[PDB]
Amino acid sequence: PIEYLLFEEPTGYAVFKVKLQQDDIGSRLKEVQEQINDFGAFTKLIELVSFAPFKGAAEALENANDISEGLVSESLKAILDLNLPKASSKKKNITLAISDKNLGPSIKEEFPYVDCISNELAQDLIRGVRLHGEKLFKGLQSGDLERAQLGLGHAYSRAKVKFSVQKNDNHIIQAIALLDQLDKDINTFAMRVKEWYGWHFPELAKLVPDNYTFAKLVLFIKDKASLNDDSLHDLAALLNEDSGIAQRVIDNARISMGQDISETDMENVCVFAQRVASLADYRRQLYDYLCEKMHTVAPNLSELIGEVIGARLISHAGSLTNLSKQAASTVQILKNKGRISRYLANKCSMASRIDNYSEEPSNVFGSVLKKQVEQRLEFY
Amino acid sequence: SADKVDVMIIQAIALLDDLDKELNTYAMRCKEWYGWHFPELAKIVTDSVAYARIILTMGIRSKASETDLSEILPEEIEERVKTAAEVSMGTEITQTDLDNINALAEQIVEFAAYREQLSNYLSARMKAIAPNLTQLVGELVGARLIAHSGSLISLAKSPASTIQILGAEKALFRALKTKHDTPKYGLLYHASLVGQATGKNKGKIARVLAAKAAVSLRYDALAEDRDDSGDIGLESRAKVENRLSQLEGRDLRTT
Amino acid sequence: APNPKAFPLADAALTQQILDVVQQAANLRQLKKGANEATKTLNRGISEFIIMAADCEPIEILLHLPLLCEDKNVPYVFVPSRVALGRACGVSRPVIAASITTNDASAIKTQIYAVKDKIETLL
Amino acid sequence: ARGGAKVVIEPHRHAGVYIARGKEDLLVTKNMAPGESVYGEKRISVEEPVPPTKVEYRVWNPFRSKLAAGIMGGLDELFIAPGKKVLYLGAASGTSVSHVSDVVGPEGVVYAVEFSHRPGRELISMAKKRPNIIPIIEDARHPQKYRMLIGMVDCVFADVAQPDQARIIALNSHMFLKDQGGVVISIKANCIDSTVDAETVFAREVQKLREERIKPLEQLTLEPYERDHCIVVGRYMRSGLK
Amino acid sequence: ISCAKYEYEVHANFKSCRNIFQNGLRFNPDVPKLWYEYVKFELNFITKLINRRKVMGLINALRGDIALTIFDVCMKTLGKHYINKHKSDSKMNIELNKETLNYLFSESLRYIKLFERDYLINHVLQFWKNPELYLKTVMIDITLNIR
RNA sequence: CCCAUAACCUUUGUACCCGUGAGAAAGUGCCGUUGCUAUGGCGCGAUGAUCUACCCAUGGGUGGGUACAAAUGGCAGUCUGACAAGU
């Protein structure tokens, strides 16, 4: 006598009402197990009654967590109070199939008059419901159970392990790869700025040391035909009239016999140089961001060597974890130079281990290893 | 008129290629850097620029669920991304990480805008340098022709067959040397007319197009007093068009 | 409140048993002694079982070894005292983790297997 | 056996497993998250015919997987196909759950189950790289505490070393395994019982399957790769074992 | 609400419509529409009660606190549940704090629009003391004090 | 399109080079605190001791191996040539 059953789902609770029991003594035979599987007989057995869907991902997480330990959440109490009829606590309780013997006494202590059954026959029915899924629901299951299943599994497991940023290092890896690409494109696009500006004007493209400030100079100085002493002092407000480059290349522009190029071409040189300027600035910003994220993630390593070098290692060895797993000699950083390097290798492997497995790690041990290798270098 | 230098054109084509490569790799990095908060967004909206603008608009999945996004999406795609926003398997992210992802996404938008600017520049510039050939074959393929063969003048002096086979030299010299049937489209294959034909008519239209392009080029690189109206391009285009209608009218199979 | 990460240690009885067998292995060259020597052996795959001190300053620099041990089903036990492990291994200095390696030309095979069971029940 | 030497891919008898012929033959499976190898195995790249894209395959090490040992020894029918769901008990890490997700492919799933926490954490990061591996970090003795997260999986692969490995597989396959669904068991006899003969351990464990209503089809000892293991391939029958 | 409507305005069973309402709130403890409607019904009922009192008189601060206790628990539930919506650093924590405050002021200003009357609004502002919004609050305060 | 929008190869520019697991050194020994004795601390190591081509008496000039850049340096030579379609 199994009057109702309670199926908890990735979304919401459902309470089914049984109509025919299956037999009890002959519960094992081939005929009766094949009727668990085949849907004509199962729909003779179970008729859906009620279904309260969960309210959000946060409650579905919380309620799965409560089922996992054993107590009864308020939504489960709500639906049970809606569906069960009020019978005597001594004579003829209302039965209920559940699939968790430990979930028994929590239900029983709330409602005194509900006797929870989980025998072979109840387990049988619950298996049947889980197999026949969503056909039984007459369409009510709003929401895609498959995607709910994925999300709920991930959220519950992530919360059991307390997954977070300070141990997350994939940010360090991606920042490294993107920094290398930025510097590659920056020097390439510097080459092309310098070539267009040189093709009308070779000598600043030979005589400016820094390509970034050259890009500022292209953004300010339009061409060799736009020249004045206020621009001289604006370069002085920029890098150096101390060198006298501004005056000298006024002379060079007065002697520069390159093509006086068209205005539209000058505007596109302008745009491309400005774009390079924005990119290089962005690179510097990301570099500082990388330093800060490292001081969160693996402070001891960073203080032991240097932030960007710790980044190099983490990207090589693949992640912080694999850096920890790595044998302390085969870690490679970049005669007696070889010996100090190998000693430092041992040290930085150990410091990486302490960063990996701690929580909010030990800049004091960053300092300890720092002074130790400093003494060895002092010997060297 | 100093606005005629094939040198700036040919290096412009090279830089256009570089732009395409770098833009794709940066959006790859952004899509998976962010998907580490919102995973299935990439697969649902595969476009780089649309992705970057989504990252500018929203920053948190539920923030997107509240916010309009439909400026840059069709609404069914909007519904998918809103629901997957409601339940991703993804995490939440801290503010500094959203900050630098955000700055990356706007930098992606800026390369897209820069490329469009460069192509508009190039189209106007080709209209200035070789407006007949531009008016015939389309200015992208015209610029690629000039880029490959180098000087506009040397391209003028090539015959018409070699303008047909200006792109496919590897397959050409392999076929010639090993006694095999030489390739037949070449670099013109991306013109709109040969992208308009069907089969053997693609091969035939590439002959007619290469010949009329040689006329157009020679009128452009040598006629010192050019009126810049591209009329030889327009005339010969009308000729090639009419050819295409005749070929595609003909029906190979019985009535 | 939950289990600390040094779990499992050993009782005094298991402690003296293990220190006994690790001494006799060090006599007969079945013992790879020290942190990264234990690590290299757990990468090669040729190690019976792992003995890790829990006294070490800090705990963490050897705490990396339970990952590989549980990756390869090779059992590990914390002994309490690192100078007791130096005691048993018979080298002059505190050894934070030693590892008893596999072999068959071994006068101490079945003694090792007995203690390996005792560990794997303790887990 | 070098960083440049080419090989000729070919497909196996199984579904979703490939062989890389060459001077020496590799058992390989197609990657899902490309570029990034997980446990250092040498992945093999190919080019395939939109302008083309490089696609990439991964070598499967038998000495570090107790499943590719079974394959590379010979199995009549393995129950993992490229469309299915594999419940995976005892998933210590990527070392094999990655490859099972490669041969399950994007349509199916693999529900990796593990109890401890540090391998759990590593499993979570990898699972974020791979969309199929739903990580469950619960004890496997009690399936009832995650009966909401899993539905009706189509094979159960089992890698525990517990001495009650029979009862744990029986619980999980009653709860979840679809009827007539494959069950792949990696017995390690020294762990399951350390005193008796390894054969005796196999007879007892196979027997317990049979009165747990898993008809065992097939049994292999996987000898040159490991000593004393045996994978038993069986079928959950549930309606008349005979 | 449809069920409540049919049992109250057709058959007049205060027990029945009451029980409908407390049950439905146990099922949905985070919908302002339902909270609104329950406060509404209690007002309608007590207005019928008070008119029954004056018509008995013609032929021959407790209820407001009922409504406002409903308001109090309504605010508690709404705050808690819209915290659980969006559920981890200090800046976004404070950001959800102000956003949730914004949400609850929106619906409580709605409650004002629902709205003896000045006594009720007094209890509302008591609830409030228990920046721009501070200004908007106090300009409403002087406006209602005039009113 | 298997990519002449490329690869090779030479040539120029820019870089580097030949696991092991237990040994290492041969009242002061040191510095300083104390007046006419108390001494402050230091005096190795599994939390890693010892091992991984040419000339001019720690120089430069040789020599090849690996990686980044360029080139109007190469491989490397630009298809056919009068008929076709309708009735």
UniProtKB/Swiss-Prot annotation, chain A:
The modification Phosphoserine is found at residue 319. Interacts with NOP1 and NOP58. Component of the ribosomal small subunit (SSU) processome composed of at least 40 protein subunits and snoRNA U3. The chain holds residues 3 to 415 of 504 of the full protein. Required for 60S ribosomal subunit synthesis. GO terms for biological process: box C/D sno(s)RNA 3'-end processing; maturation of SSU-rRNA; rRNA modification; rRNA processing; snoRNA guided rRNA 2'-O-methylation. Changing residue 331 to A: Reduced growth rate at all temperatures. Its main location: nucleus. One of its GO terms (molecular function) is mRNA binding. It is found in: Nucleus, Nucleolus. Transmembrane segments: none annotated. It comes from the Eukaryota. Residues 297-380 form the Nop domain. Present with 13500 molecules/cell in log phase SD medium. This is Nucleolar protein 56. GO terms for cellular component: 90S preribosome; box C/D methylation guide snoRNP complex; nucleolus; nucleoplasm; nucleus; small-subunit processome. Belongs to the NOP5/NOP56 family. Keywords: Nucleus, Phosphoprotein, Ribonucleoprotein, Ribosome biogenesis.
UniProtKB/Swiss-Prot annotation, chain C:
It comes from the Eukaryota. The keyword Ribosomal protein does not apply. Changing residue 57 to A: Impairs binding to U4 snRNA, but not U3 snoRNA. Causes pre-mRNA splicing and pre-rRNA processing defects. GO terms for biological process: box C/D sno(s)RNA 3'-end processing; maturation of SSU-rRNA; maturation of SSU-rRNA from tricistronic rRNA transcript (SSU-rRNA, 5.8S rRNA, LSU-rRNA); mRNA splicing, via spliceosome; snoRNA guided rRNA 2'-O-methylation; spliceosomal complex assembly. The keyword RNA-binding applies. One of its GO terms (cellular component) is nucleolus. It is found in: Nucleus, Nucleolus. GO terms for molecular function: RNA binding; U3 snoRNA binding; U4 snRNA binding. Keywords: mRNA processing, mRNA splicing, Nucleus, Ribonucleoprotein, Ribosome biogenesis, RNA-binding, rRNA processing, Spliceosome. Binds to the C'/D and B/C motifs in U3 snoRNA. Component of the U4/U6-U5 tri-snRNP complex composed of the U4, U6 and U5 snRNAs and at least PRP3, PRP4, PRP6, PRP8, PRP18, PRP31, PRP38, SNU13, SNU23, SNU66, SNU114, SPP381, SMB1, SMD1, SMD2, SMD3, SMX2, SMX3, LSM2, LSM3, LSM4, LSM5, LSM6, LSM7, LSM8, BRR2 and DIB1. Binds to the 5'-stem-loop of U4 snRNA. Component of the ribosomal small subunit (SSU) processome composed of at least 40 protein subunits and snoRNA U3. Belongs to the eukaryotic ribosomal protein eL8 family. PANTHER family: RIBOSOMAL PROTEIN L7AE FAMILY MEMBER. This is 13 kDa ribonucleoprotein-associated protein. The gene is SNU13.
UniProtKB/Swiss-Prot annotation, chain D:
There is a cross-link at residue 66 (Glycyl lysine isopeptide (Lys-Gly) (interchain with G-Cter in ubiquitin)). Residues 95-96, 114-115, 139-140, 159-162 are annotated as: S-adenosyl-L-methionine binding. The modification Omega-N-methylarginine is found at residue 2. GO terms for biological process: box C/D sno(s)RNA 3'-end processing; maturation of SSU-rRNA; regulation of transcription by RNA polymerase I; rRNA 2'-O-methylation; rRNA methylation; rRNA processing; snoRNA guided rRNA 2'-O-methylation. Methylated by HMT1, forming asymmetric dimethylarginines (DMA) within a domain referred to as an RGG box, made up of repeated Gly-Gly dipeptides interspersed with Arg and aromatic residues. It is an enzyme of class 2 (transferase). One of its GO terms (cellular component) is box C/D methylation guide snoRNP complex. The keyword Nucleus applies. It comes from the Eukaryota. Changing residue 91 to V: In nop1.3; thermosensitive allele showing a decrease in histone-glutamine N-methyltransferase activity upon shift to restrictive temperature. Its EC number is 2.1.1.-. The modification Asymmetric dimethylarginine is found at residue 2. Changing residue 24 to G: In nop1.3; thermosensitive allele showing a decrease in histone-glutamine N-methyltransferase activity upon shift to restrictive temperature. It is found in: Nucleus, Nucleolus. Keywords: Isopeptide bond, Methylation, Methyltransferase, Nucleus, Ribonucleoprotein, Ribosome biogenesis, RNA-binding, rRNA processing, S-adenosyl-L-methionine, Transferase, Ubl conjugation. It catalyses: L-glutaminyl-[histone H2A] + S-adenosyl-L-methionine = N(5)-methyl-L-glutaminyl-[histone H2A] + S-adenosyl-L-homocysteine + H(+); a ribonucleotide in rRNA + S-adenosyl-L-methionine = a 2'-O-methylribonucleotide in rRNA + S-adenosyl-L-homocysteine + H(+). Residues 197-229 are annotated as: Helical. The keyword Transport does not apply. The gene is NOP1.
From Swiss-Prot, chain E:
It is found in: Nucleus, Nucleolus. HAT repeats lie at residues 12-44. Signal peptide: none annotated. It comes from the Eukaryota. Component of the SSU processome, a pre-ribosomal particle required for the maturation of the 18S rRNA from the 35S pre-rRNA precursor. Present with 7520 molecules/cell in log phase SD medium. Belongs to the UTP6 family. Component of the ribosomal small subunit (SSU) processome, or 90S pre-ribosomal particle, composed of the 35S pre-rRNA precursor, the U3 snoRNA, and at least 40 protein subunits. Component of the PWP2/UTP-B subcomplex composed of DIP2, PWP2, UTP6, UTP13, UTP18 and UTP21. Interacts with U3 snoRNA. Interacts with MPP10. This is U3 small nucleolar RNA-associated protein 6.
